[PDB]
Design an enzyme around this catalytic site. Sequence first.
Site, short mmCIF file in Angstrom:
data_model
loop_
_atom_site.label_atom_id
_atom_site.label_comp_id
_atom_site.label_asym_id
_atom_site.label_seq_id
_atom_site.Cartn_x
_atom_site.Cartn_y
_atom_site.Cartn_z
N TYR A 1 0.84 -1.18 0.00
CA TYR A 1 0.00 0.00 0.00
C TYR A 1 0.88 1.24 0.00
O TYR A 1 1.20 1.80 1.06
CB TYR A 1 -0.91 0.01 1.23
CG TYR A 1 -2.17 0.82 1.05
CD1 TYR A 1 -3.42 0.22 1.10
CD2 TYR A 1 -2.11 2.20 0.82
CE1 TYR A 1 -4.59 0.96 0.93
CE2 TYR A 1 -3.27 2.95 0.65
CZ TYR A 1 -4.51 2.33 0.70
OH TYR A 1 -5.66 3.07 0.54
N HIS B 1 -13.18 -3.63 1.58
CA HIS B 1 -13.45 -3.86 2.99
C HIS B 1 -14.40 -5.03 3.26
O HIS B 1 -15.29 -5.32 2.47
CB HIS B 1 -14.04 -2.60 3.64
CG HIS B 1 -14.64 -2.84 4.99
ND1 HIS B 1 -15.94 -3.29 5.16
CD2 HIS B 1 -14.11 -2.77 6.23
CE1 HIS B 1 -16.17 -3.48 6.44
NE2 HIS B 1 -15.07 -3.18 7.12
N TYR C 1 -3.74 -4.96 7.36
CA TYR C 1 -2.72 -4.03 6.90
C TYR C 1 -1.62 -4.23 7.94
O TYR C 1 -1.91 -4.36 9.13
CB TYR C 1 -3.20 -2.58 6.95
CG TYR C 1 -4.29 -2.22 5.97
CD1 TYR C 1 -4.11 -2.40 4.60
CD2 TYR C 1 -5.48 -1.65 6.41
CE1 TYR C 1 -5.09 -2.00 3.68
CE2 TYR C 1 -6.46 -1.25 5.50
CZ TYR C 1 -6.26 -1.42 4.15
OH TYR C 1 -7.23 -1.01 3.26
N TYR D 1 -11.45 -2.05 7.21
CA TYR D 1 -10.99 -0.67 7.19
C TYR D 1 -10.90 -0.06 8.58
O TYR D 1 -10.13 0.88 8.81
CB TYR D 1 -11.90 0.17 6.29
CG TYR D 1 -11.74 -0.10 4.80
CD1 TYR D 1 -10.92 -1.14 4.33
CD2 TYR D 1 -12.40 0.69 3.86
CE1 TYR D 1 -10.78 -1.38 2.96
CE2 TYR D 1 -12.27 0.46 2.50
CZ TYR D 1 -11.45 -0.57 2.05
OH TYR D 1 -11.33 -0.78 0.69
C1 LIG Z 1 -9.39 1.54 -1.03
S1 LIG Z 1 -10.69 1.56 -2.28
C2 LIG Z 1 -10.70 -0.28 -2.65
C3 LIG Z 1 -10.83 -0.34 -4.21
C4 LIG Z 1 -12.06 0.24 -5.00
N1 LIG Z 1 -13.20 -0.67 -4.85
C5 LIG Z 1 -11.67 0.58 -6.45
O1 LIG Z 1 -12.29 0.11 -7.41
O2 LIG Z 1 -10.71 1.34 -6.67
C6 LIG Z 1 -12.15 2.17 -1.29
C7 LIG Z 1 -13.46 2.31 -1.99
O3 LIG Z 1 -13.96 1.04 -2.46
C8 LIG Z 1 -15.38 0.88 -2.18
N2 LIG Z 1 -15.32 -0.20 -1.17
C9 LIG Z 1 -14.46 -0.93 -0.29
N3 LIG Z 1 -15.02 -1.87 0.42
C10 LIG Z 1 -16.35 -1.83 0.05
C11 LIG Z 1 -17.53 -2.61 0.45
N4 LIG Z 1 -17.49 -3.60 1.36
N5 LIG Z 1 -18.80 -2.31 -0.13
C12 LIG Z 1 -18.89 -1.29 -1.07
N6 LIG Z 1 -17.87 -0.49 -1.54
C13 LIG Z 1 -16.59 -0.82 -0.92
C14 LIG Z 1 -15.85 2.37 -2.27
O4 LIG Z 1 -15.90 3.40 -3.18
C15 LIG Z 1 -14.70 2.84 -1.28
O5 LIG Z 1 -14.43 4.13 -0.82
#
Ligand SMILES: C[S@@+](CC[C@H](N)C(=O)[O-])C[C@H]1O[C@@H](n2cnc3c(N)ncnc32)[C@H](O)[C@@H]1O
EC number: 2.1.1.364
Length: 234
Positions: free
Chosen positions: A130, A182, A190, A220
Site C-alpha cells: 500500500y 473492505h 494491513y 478498514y
Molecule cells: C481503497 S478503495 C478499494 C478499491 C475500490 N473498490 C476501487 O475500485 O478502486 C475504497 C473504496 O472502495 C469501495 N469499497 C471498499 N469496500 C467496500 C464494500 N465492502 N462495499 C462497497 N464499496 C466498498 C468504495 O468506493 C470505497 O471508498
Amino acid sequence: HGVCWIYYPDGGSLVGEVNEDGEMTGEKIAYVYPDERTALYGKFIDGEMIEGKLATLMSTEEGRPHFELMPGNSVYHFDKSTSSCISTNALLPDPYESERVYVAESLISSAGEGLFSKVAVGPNTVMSFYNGVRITHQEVDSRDWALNGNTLSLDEETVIDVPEPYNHVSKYCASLGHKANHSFTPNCIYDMFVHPRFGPIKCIRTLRAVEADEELTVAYGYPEWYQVELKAFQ
Ligand SMILES: C[S@@+](CC[C@H](N)C(=O)[O-])C[C@H]1O[C@@H](n2cnc3c(N)ncnc32)[C@H](O)[C@@H]1O
C-alpha cells in the site's frame, strides 16, 4: 567480517558485505522479499537501493547467497513518495506483488474493483503493498471526506493516500494495496512494511490460508456504504 543479513520484522531482508565502515554499500548488495526467493540485486549505498535488478535467490552457503538475474532490463531504486509525487515510474509494477495479486471486478456488489490472489498461500503471507503520497492527519481530517476513500494511516505523523487519478490501474500500478475492498470478516490485515523502493509503508498480509483467485479483503476499521454494510453484518 563476512556477509551480513539484516532482517526486518516483516520478513524482508538486506544482504551483502559491509564496507570498511560497516555499511551495505557496493554493486553486489541485495534486498530479498519475504518469500526468501525474490530479490533486487545490485548497487546499494548505506542500505539504500540505487540500482536493483530482479533476481532469484537460488541458495545460500554459510550465509553467502547465490543470485541469478531474471531476464529483462527493468531497474528499481529507492523512490519514496512525497506529498505530491507518488512515484517516479507509476506504471512499473512491483515484481513480488505482480506474482501474487491481480485486479478485477469485486465480488462485493457495487464495490467497484477488488484485489484477488493469484496463488494459494498460507497464513501471514505478504501479498500486496500500500504505497501512495504522504500527507498529514490534519490535511486528511480537515479536507472534504469524499477525498478520503483511499487514505490509510501509516503512523503518528503520516497518512498514505492514492489520489483520484492514481486510483486507476491505467495511471498507477506500482503497488495495488489500495484495491483491496473492505469486509467485516476479512482474510487480510494491513501491516507495517519496509520496502526497498517505497520505503516505510503498509502491506496487505493474509490472516490465514487463501486460495488462488480468492478476493482479498481487509477491515478498514472506521462513509454511507460502510454504515449500510455494518447494519447488514449486525
Ligand atoms: C481503497 S478503495 C478499494 C478499491 C475500490 N473498490 C476501487 O475500485 O478502486 C475504497 C473504496 O472502495 C469501495 N469499497 C471498499 N469496500 C467496500 C464494500 N465492502 N462495499 C462497497 N464499496 C466498498 C468504495 O468506493 C470505497 O471508498
